[PDB]
């Protein structure tokens, strides 16, 4: 009765939190077309969240275990809603839009408060759900909660896409005078409406926790016992080894997921939409289904702790074994003159021989920086039409065709990177299928992980363990994994882009072989380390 009510309230809170994070991610990304934002501002916006969450996660998890957990969760939800509403404050204060000073403080404070209020949700909520539920149903409840958490960001991104379709000043200025269209690239959307909706939903999600009981059928002592509790948690070998296992596995998973869309873009030549669509709307449902399936399997067969560890190890092994198969599914580099091939059509050229300037385009004073893709009738892609030796351009229908191009004749061409011919879409189909299966298999061992985490510690330290677990994920896996993955990937960049100010943008073209090698190898190595640690965990469990 009351347990189901708490489960529903926690699921709604998880949905609201994930919707807020997904909307933030979608809006920041989609605002790029009009407002050229420095890479520092987006980084600081994300990092204020991290500081706010990490500074209080441990204290809330520990000092809130014996307090009124539902009321602390409700207060955290209220703080999250207040921060989300504060994020949208600058809209009401800035002047009407017409087509970094004293205005981003609102955004930073709103994100800081949101990160602070996010902390009591997972540790205290999961501990409360586990304490008063039967041993069989705890896994199922945690599985449902984590499935909702995984699903949420899809709804957040959908809300972001819906809001970006509306004009920024809707309600403030009559839309009849507005003559601009979203296709016109001076358009900016109503980013504040989604933040207001997310804040309202987060505030409404805190209502049920005021009526939930403290338990189902002082601070000085906590301060004194904090250190012995930490020693007991780290004195437990199962907990420490599973913490290391999860840290390494999430180091692998965050790196794989973060740069998966870019890997698809560069390896298989797919468009920007084609990759984000198959990642957000295909792999995330697979992850959610894997989590739910793991929870259902744990509940139905009454799998014990040893069985949970065995399932974790098996899921990890059978996921990374399938991920190893992605090495075979690789397309070769597209024929690009001056970077991968020379203007004479020679097969791969070394580093020292990069001949962006050639004899055929010698009469052409071209700029090195711009990247406008085009390929001629010979099937060789060129950096831009200027370096192709083209003299005249004709606009036919929706396309532009360049004539009298000297380099290709060594003479017509089309704009954009024309497709890879030697069966690359066929390989892309198998890559997509194997990636979906790998994501499902790897996410299958998610709830057995939590069961292993909760069934091998003394109960009065469940909350203070879970928070540490979360603190372990963000400090060691959530934050670092994108950084060095991106660095090692960018070591394989052949041509860099630039922004309107001069700082280098995202790399426009990578070497397919080195990119695939690094991206798959790092993930597989981290997965192998995680598998070894899981084997150690299973052996220690069998010993005890
Ligand atoms: C970032 C954001 C979209 C853009 C919003 C914005 C956009 C512009 C802005 O002011 C302008 O910023 C420029 C910049 O960008 O450098 C500076 O050059 C200008 O001098 C400054 O007048 C302030 C804000 C505050 C809220 C921001 C939103 C919060 C959530 C979101 O998605």
XYZ file of C-alpha atoms and ligand atoms in Angstrom:
576
model
C 0.000 0.000 0.000
C 2.236 2.789 1.264
C 5.239 1.100 -0.358
C 3.577 1.242 -3.782
C 2.724 4.908 -3.195
C 6.361 5.644 -2.357
C 7.466 3.716 -5.446
C 5.139 5.756 -7.665
C 6.277 9.030 -6.083
C 9.950 8.121 -6.511
C 9.344 7.079 -10.124
C 7.649 10.408 -10.856
C 10.519 12.265 -9.173
C 13.046 10.329 -11.265
C 11.042 11.139 -14.398
C 10.976 14.854 -13.545
C 14.710 14.923 -12.802
C 15.605 13.083 -16.011
C 13.261 15.293 -18.040
C 14.991 18.374 -16.633
C 18.452 17.040 -17.479
C 17.383 15.984 -20.977
C 15.805 19.366 -21.664
C 18.955 21.129 -20.453
C 21.123 18.987 -22.734
C 18.810 19.452 -25.748
C 18.409 23.219 -25.282
C 22.117 23.967 -24.808
C 22.908 21.974 -27.951
C 20.098 23.419 -30.097
C 20.795 27.038 -29.093
C 24.065 26.754 -31.033
C 22.623 27.871 -34.395
C 22.040 31.495 -33.312
C 24.165 32.198 -30.215
C 27.804 31.249 -30.720
C 28.630 30.329 -27.127
C 32.257 29.901 -25.997
C 33.156 26.351 -25.011
C 33.957 27.641 -21.514
C 30.429 28.850 -20.708
C 28.795 25.506 -21.536
C 31.486 23.748 -19.505
C 30.985 25.984 -16.469
C 27.201 25.581 -16.750
C 27.622 21.808 -16.539
C 30.307 21.996 -13.841
C 28.342 24.144 -11.402
C 25.886 21.240 -11.301
C 28.742 18.831 -10.561
C 30.133 20.975 -7.739
C 26.705 21.445 -6.174
C 25.928 17.732 -6.290
C 29.325 16.451 -5.119
C 29.693 18.930 -2.256
C 26.572 17.607 -0.494
C 25.937 14.071 -1.817
C 27.920 12.341 0.938
C 26.603 14.527 3.763
C 22.971 14.138 2.678
C 23.355 10.383 2.194
C 24.949 9.841 5.607
C 23.167 12.346 7.857
C 19.767 11.635 6.280
C 19.687 7.867 6.811
C 18.077 7.992 10.266
C 16.138 11.215 9.609
C 12.772 11.510 7.834
C 13.883 10.241 4.427
C 10.661 11.069 2.492
C 10.694 14.653 3.778
C 14.354 15.066 2.814
C 13.519 13.743 -0.661
C 10.646 16.220 -0.894
C 12.908 19.091 0.145
C 15.425 18.015 -2.488
C 12.681 17.999 -5.117
C 11.592 21.486 -4.031
C 15.184 22.717 -4.354
C 15.459 21.116 -7.804
C 12.265 22.846 -8.901
C 13.454 26.192 -7.546
C 16.749 25.861 -9.410
C 15.043 24.825 -12.643
C 12.711 27.826 -12.410
C 15.685 30.088 -11.643
C 17.420 28.888 -14.819
C 14.662 30.527 -16.896
C 14.836 33.852 -15.021
C 17.003 35.789 -17.557
C 14.184 35.703 -20.135
C 11.959 37.965 -18.029
C 14.864 40.376 -17.412
C 16.649 40.647 -20.771
C 15.318 42.972 -23.451
C 13.222 41.725 -26.359
C 15.264 39.757 -28.879
C 16.212 41.822 -31.935
C 17.439 40.570 -35.308
C 28.717 37.309 -20.617
C 27.994 40.023 -18.049
C 25.699 40.019 -15.000
C 23.125 37.658 -16.548
C 24.633 34.145 -16.458
C 24.760 34.257 -12.642
C 21.085 33.272 -12.673
C 21.876 30.221 -14.808
C 24.827 29.152 -12.655
C 22.867 29.545 -9.405
C 19.870 27.713 -10.855
C 22.058 24.816 -11.934
C 23.898 24.803 -8.586
C 20.649 24.577 -6.623
C 19.383 21.871 -8.976
C 22.534 19.829 -8.406
C 22.221 20.324 -4.647
C 18.587 19.194 -4.611
C 19.335 16.213 -6.852
C 21.476 14.527 -4.189
C 18.869 13.059 -1.758
C 16.918 11.362 -4.565
C 18.938 8.239 -5.322
C 20.678 7.191 -2.048
C 17.844 7.831 0.395
C 15.122 6.821 -2.055
C 16.705 3.507 -3.019
C 17.589 2.735 0.604
C 14.005 3.423 1.705
C 12.687 1.269 -1.139
C 15.039 -1.586 -0.214
C 14.536 -1.475 3.566
C 10.755 -1.960 3.634
C 10.363 -4.175 0.553
C 10.656 -7.942 0.425
C 13.950 -9.366 -0.804
C 12.371 -10.469 -4.093
C 10.507 -7.243 -4.925
C 13.354 -4.852 -4.070
C 15.185 -5.727 -7.289
C 12.024 -5.214 -9.347
C 11.301 -1.846 -7.727
C 14.871 -0.641 -8.286
C 14.627 -1.861 -11.877
C 11.451 0.129 -12.474
C 13.010 3.248 -10.937
C 16.178 2.975 -13.032
C 14.143 2.275 -16.178
C 12.184 5.484 -15.577
C 15.465 7.332 -14.997
C 16.888 6.060 -18.295
C 13.668 6.821 -20.190
C 13.313 10.400 -18.905
C 15.957 12.092 -21.089
C 14.081 11.057 -24.250
C 11.057 13.019 -23.035
C 13.370 15.877 -22.078
C 14.812 16.019 -25.594
C 11.320 15.791 -27.093
C 10.255 18.750 -24.939
C 13.358 20.651 -26.036
C 12.591 20.031 -29.704
C 8.989 21.132 -29.161
C 10.042 24.328 -27.367
C 12.668 25.237 -29.972
C 9.865 25.295 -32.558
C 8.189 28.203 -30.724
C 9.435 31.772 -30.966
C 11.478 33.142 -28.076
C 9.118 36.024 -27.218
C 5.799 34.148 -27.302
C 3.347 35.861 -24.972
C 5.565 38.905 -24.478
C 5.381 40.270 -28.048
C 2.539 39.696 -30.515
C 3.641 37.106 -33.070
C 1.953 38.879 -36.000
C 4.877 41.311 -36.340
C 7.339 38.389 -36.430
C 8.302 37.539 -40.018
C 11.131 35.080 -39.295
C 11.004 31.299 -39.775
C 12.984 28.612 -37.890
C 14.799 27.825 -41.155
C 16.141 31.397 -41.131
C 19.313 31.016 -39.027
C 18.701 34.149 -36.960
C 15.901 32.225 -35.236
C 16.091 31.483 -31.511
C 13.548 29.383 -29.658
C 11.580 29.613 -26.420
C 14.148 27.887 -24.235
C 12.620 29.297 -21.039
C 9.228 27.597 -21.416
C 10.685 24.111 -21.047
C 12.620 25.173 -17.957
C 9.432 26.595 -16.437
C 7.536 23.377 -17.204
C 10.324 21.225 -15.751
C 10.468 23.338 -12.595
C 6.697 23.161 -12.153
C 6.768 19.378 -12.611
C 9.635 19.027 -10.126
C 7.761 21.124 -7.558
C 4.596 19.062 -8.065
C 6.609 15.853 -7.634
C 7.409 16.856 -4.030
C 3.760 16.899 -2.869
C 3.390 13.136 -2.135
C 6.463 13.030 0.125
C 4.819 15.277 2.729
C 2.263 12.537 3.485
C 4.513 9.482 3.515
C 5.454 7.844 6.834
C 8.987 7.853 8.189
C 9.154 4.051 8.438
C 7.027 1.083 7.389
C 6.206 -2.109 9.375
C 21.414 12.864 17.674
C 23.493 14.589 14.998
C 26.514 14.536 17.321
C 26.405 10.730 17.365
C 26.305 10.775 13.558
C 29.362 13.037 13.449
C 31.201 10.751 15.873
C 30.271 7.592 13.943
C 30.952 8.967 10.439
C 34.587 7.823 10.329
C 33.971 4.275 11.681
C 31.151 3.928 9.144
C 33.506 4.873 6.304
C 36.108 2.410 7.585
C 33.453 -0.318 7.785
C 32.326 0.365 4.214
C 35.905 0.294 2.933
C 36.735 -2.605 5.252
C 34.104 -4.632 3.389
C 35.940 -6.262 0.451
C 32.852 -7.106 -1.609
C 31.653 -3.495 -1.518
C 35.072 -2.065 -2.398
C 35.672 -4.492 -5.263
C 32.184 -3.956 -6.694
C 32.747 -0.204 -6.421
C 35.941 -0.542 -8.460
C 34.161 -2.830 -10.942
C 31.311 -0.364 -11.452
C 33.734 2.561 -11.716
C 35.725 0.875 -14.489
C 32.616 -0.389 -16.295
C 31.047 3.076 -16.278
C 34.357 4.556 -17.426
C 33.950 2.235 -20.410
C 30.238 2.929 -20.904
C 30.314 6.736 -20.700
C 33.193 6.851 -23.172
C 31.408 4.488 -25.541
C 28.051 6.296 -25.381
C 29.380 9.864 -25.509
C 31.322 9.464 -28.769
C 29.112 6.785 -30.364
C 27.130 9.344 -32.459
C 30.361 10.902 -33.715
C 31.773 7.443 -34.432
C 28.724 6.686 -36.580
C 29.009 10.080 -38.306
C 32.643 9.593 -39.262
C 32.868 5.839 -39.853
C 29.656 5.407 -41.862
C 29.197 8.892 -43.332
C 25.735 9.266 -41.815
C 24.215 12.705 -41.347
C 23.975 14.468 -37.993
C 20.270 13.679 -37.605
C 20.708 10.047 -38.696
C 23.133 9.370 -35.823
C 21.381 11.262 -33.007
C 18.133 9.565 -34.030
C 19.575 6.048 -33.852
C 21.312 6.820 -30.556
C 18.608 8.648 -28.601
C 15.579 6.721 -29.859
C 17.100 3.255 -30.351
C 20.001 2.597 -27.973
C 18.402 4.311 -24.958
C 15.242 2.150 -25.253
C 17.559 -0.866 -25.450
C 19.306 0.230 -22.240
C 15.970 0.752 -20.485
C 14.717 -2.648 -21.656
C 17.927 -4.274 -20.442
C 17.598 -2.700 -16.996
C 13.946 -3.741 -16.740
C 14.756 -7.267 -17.935
C 17.503 -7.584 -15.335
C 15.110 -6.492 -12.609
C 12.398 -8.882 -13.801
C 14.862 -11.786 -13.976
C 16.119 -11.041 -10.464
C 12.579 -10.898 -9.063
C 10.992 -13.859 -10.841
C 13.593 -16.560 -10.137
C 14.480 -15.334 -6.612
C 18.132 -14.997 -7.587
C 20.447 -14.735 -4.581
C 23.544 -12.571 -4.142
C 25.866 -15.169 -5.681
C 23.462 -15.558 -8.588
C 23.350 -11.775 -8.921
C 27.146 -11.617 -9.169
C 27.132 -14.454 -11.707
C 24.513 -12.624 -13.783
C 26.557 -9.413 -13.596
C 29.695 -11.201 -14.794
C 27.835 -13.027 -17.559
C 26.152 -9.871 -18.833
C 29.459 -7.988 -18.859
C 31.255 -10.840 -20.644
C 28.562 -11.337 -23.286
C 28.274 -7.593 -23.852
C 31.963 -6.915 -24.335
C 32.381 -10.056 -26.453
C 29.756 -8.671 -28.835
C 31.369 -5.223 -28.691
C 34.623 -6.876 -29.791
C 32.869 -7.869 -33.027
C 32.649 -4.204 -34.078
C 36.277 -4.251 -35.266
C 35.278 -6.234 -38.357
C 32.390 -3.851 -39.114
C 34.431 -0.918 -40.348
C 34.399 1.207 -43.495
C 37.550 2.591 -45.083
C 38.409 6.278 -45.340
C 36.454 8.310 -47.865
C 38.537 9.441 -50.834
C 39.391 13.011 -49.799
C 42.007 14.915 -51.784
C 44.878 16.407 -49.798
C 44.165 14.646 -46.487
C 43.622 10.928 -47.172
C 44.562 10.853 -50.876
C 46.580 13.154 -53.095
C 45.168 15.157 -55.992
C 46.622 12.499 -58.325
C 44.367 9.825 -56.805
C 47.069 7.985 -54.846
C 46.110 5.571 -52.063
C 46.803 6.542 -48.429
C 49.326 9.370 -48.087
C 51.597 9.854 -45.075
C 51.464 12.658 -42.505
C 54.283 14.819 -43.891
C 52.698 14.899 -47.377
C 49.558 16.986 -46.862
C 49.067 18.936 -50.078
C 45.918 21.035 -49.560
C 47.586 23.396 -52.042
C 48.337 21.735 -55.386
C 49.221 22.680 -58.951
C 45.636 22.384 -60.218
C 44.336 24.871 -57.628
C 47.539 26.937 -57.713
C 45.800 29.788 -59.540
C 43.150 29.792 -56.780
C 43.670 31.854 -53.621
C 41.693 29.692 -51.199
C 41.386 29.837 -47.420
C 42.669 26.836 -45.475
C 40.149 27.219 -42.657
C 36.727 26.746 -44.267
C 35.276 23.264 -44.821
C 32.559 23.071 -47.499
C 32.433 19.492 -48.776
C 32.139 18.683 -52.475
C 33.144 15.794 -54.738
C 33.431 15.627 -58.512
C 32.475 12.982 -61.039
C 35.670 11.049 -60.221
C 34.370 10.180 -56.741
C 37.109 12.077 -54.868
C 35.991 14.458 -52.126
C 37.574 17.915 -52.010
C 37.954 20.264 -49.052
C 36.091 23.063 -50.847
C 35.035 24.084 -54.342
C 37.854 26.649 -54.496
C 40.551 23.967 -54.272
C 38.808 21.890 -56.959
C 39.676 24.492 -59.603
C 36.027 25.244 -60.361
C 35.283 28.483 -62.219
C 31.478 28.554 -62.582
C 28.597 27.399 -60.386
C 25.018 26.710 -61.487
C 22.069 26.365 -59.104
C 19.787 23.603 -60.418
C 16.798 22.789 -58.235
C 17.982 22.308 -54.664
C 21.553 21.489 -55.755
C 24.598 23.477 -56.865
C 26.860 22.054 -59.584
C 30.369 23.369 -60.244
C 31.819 23.297 -63.762
C 35.304 23.640 -65.259
C 37.025 22.198 -62.181
C 40.663 21.546 -63.071
C 41.598 19.056 -60.344
C 38.837 16.502 -60.993
C 39.637 16.408 -64.714
C 43.177 15.255 -63.918
C 34.634 18.213 -64.992
C 31.465 18.545 -62.906
C 30.821 17.957 -59.227
C 28.235 18.059 -56.475
C 28.225 19.653 -53.023
C 28.601 17.528 -49.901
C 30.350 14.263 -49.208
C 29.021 11.758 -51.715
C 28.371 8.322 -50.315
C 30.789 5.490 -49.591
C 30.252 2.843 -52.272
C 31.919 -0.441 -51.249
C 29.088 -1.786 -49.123
C 29.331 0.643 -46.209
C 25.568 0.866 -45.447
C 25.531 -2.935 -45.264
C 28.226 -2.783 -42.576
C 26.328 0.040 -40.855
C 23.236 -2.157 -40.541
C 25.208 -4.916 -38.800
C 26.929 -2.304 -36.629
C 23.556 -0.934 -35.538
C 22.170 -4.397 -34.759
C 25.254 -5.477 -32.805
C 25.370 -2.161 -30.932
C 21.720 -2.539 -29.900
C 22.312 -6.102 -28.703
C 25.488 -5.063 -26.864
C 23.702 -2.184 -25.132
C 20.876 -4.485 -24.041
C 23.299 -7.131 -22.766
C 25.465 -4.629 -20.878
C 22.432 -2.953 -19.306
C 20.963 -6.332 -18.318
C 23.408 -6.468 -15.400
C 22.414 -3.135 -13.902
C 20.005 -4.154 -11.124
C 22.088 -7.209 -10.120
C 24.801 -4.621 -9.504
C 22.605 -2.749 -7.025
C 21.614 -6.026 -5.367
C 25.299 -6.901 -4.992
C 25.837 -3.384 -3.605
C 23.067 -3.601 -0.987
C 23.113 -7.244 0.147
C 26.738 -7.308 1.359
C 26.797 -4.371 3.810
C 25.298 -3.876 7.237
C 21.813 -2.402 6.693
C 22.200 0.813 8.718
C 24.816 1.958 6.165
C 22.869 1.363 2.947
C 22.177 5.049 2.268
C 25.713 6.168 3.123
C 26.955 3.435 0.794
C 24.714 4.319 -2.151
C 25.712 7.975 -2.086
C 29.378 7.002 -2.051
C 28.630 4.758 -5.026
C 27.097 7.735 -6.818
C 30.041 9.887 -5.742
C 32.308 7.208 -7.193
C 30.499 7.257 -10.538
C 30.570 11.015 -11.125
C 34.069 11.716 -9.779
C 35.857 8.801 -11.447
C 33.588 7.759 -14.342
C 31.057 10.463 -15.211
C 33.503 13.373 -15.451
C 36.831 11.893 -16.650
C 35.601 9.371 -19.228
C 34.488 11.888 -21.910
C 37.650 13.975 -21.482
C 40.436 11.511 -22.279
C 38.253 9.607 -24.752
C 37.842 12.865 -26.667
C 41.537 13.672 -26.398
C 42.637 10.276 -27.732
C 40.005 10.503 -30.476
C 41.201 13.983 -31.484
C 44.736 12.639 -31.835
C 43.308 11.034 -35.010
C 41.978 14.300 -36.479
C 43.140 15.269 -39.968
C 41.376 18.616 -40.512
C 40.228 20.991 -37.774
C 37.318 23.401 -37.985
C 37.141 26.922 -36.598
C 34.525 29.149 -34.997
C 33.610 32.744 -35.825
C 36.151 34.030 -33.272
C 39.173 31.925 -34.290
C 39.237 29.135 -31.673
C 39.194 25.636 -33.162
C 35.788 23.965 -33.288
C 34.891 20.306 -33.530
C 37.136 18.276 -35.815
C 35.587 17.957 -39.259
C 37.313 14.795 -40.551
C 39.051 11.973 -38.675
C 41.073 9.021 -39.926
C 38.626 6.114 -39.960
C 41.100 3.372 -39.034
C 42.724 5.182 -36.103
C 39.377 6.526 -34.871
C 37.784 3.069 -34.865
C 40.880 1.461 -33.343
C 41.115 3.895 -30.426
C 37.371 4.127 -29.780
C 36.812 0.367 -29.696
C 40.112 -0.530 -28.022
C 39.733 1.796 -25.045
C 36.206 0.507 -24.423
C 37.284 -3.132 -24.744
C 40.280 -2.665 -22.427
C 38.129 -1.008 -19.766
C 35.550 -3.770 -20.168
C 38.230 -6.429 -19.727
C 39.429 -4.747 -16.528
C 35.824 -4.620 -15.307
C 35.391 -8.324 -16.116
C 38.534 -9.211 -14.162
C 37.286 -7.206 -11.179
C 33.891 -8.924 -11.457
C 35.636 -12.308 -11.419
C 37.448 -11.235 -8.253
C 34.121 -10.164 -6.715
C 32.524 -13.508 -7.576
C 35.464 -15.441 -6.129
C 35.339 -13.465 -2.879
C 31.571 -13.995 -2.651
C 32.041 -17.742 -3.123
C 34.728 -17.669 -0.425
C 32.326 -16.043 2.053
C 22.509 29.617 -22.727
C 20.993 29.710 -22.863
C 20.581 30.274 -24.211
C 21.117 31.706 -24.326
C 20.734 32.602 -23.140
C 21.465 33.886 -23.203
C 21.892 34.363 -24.437
C 22.581 35.566 -24.525
C 22.846 36.295 -23.373
O 23.524 37.485 -23.435
C 24.508 37.709 -24.443
O 25.442 36.629 -24.452
C 26.401 36.757 -25.501
C 27.269 35.534 -25.535
O 26.718 34.417 -25.638
O 28.507 35.679 -25.463
C 27.257 37.991 -25.245
O 28.192 38.156 -26.315
C 26.378 39.232 -25.137
O 27.173 40.346 -24.717
C 25.251 39.005 -24.136
O 24.339 40.108 -24.179
C 22.414 35.818 -22.142
C 21.723 34.616 -22.048
C 21.289 34.155 -20.670
C 20.504 32.849 -20.699
C 21.028 31.946 -21.798
C 20.364 30.582 -21.800
C 20.369 29.747 -20.523
C 20.040 28.333 -21.010
C 20.419 28.385 -22.473
O 20.292 27.451 -23.243
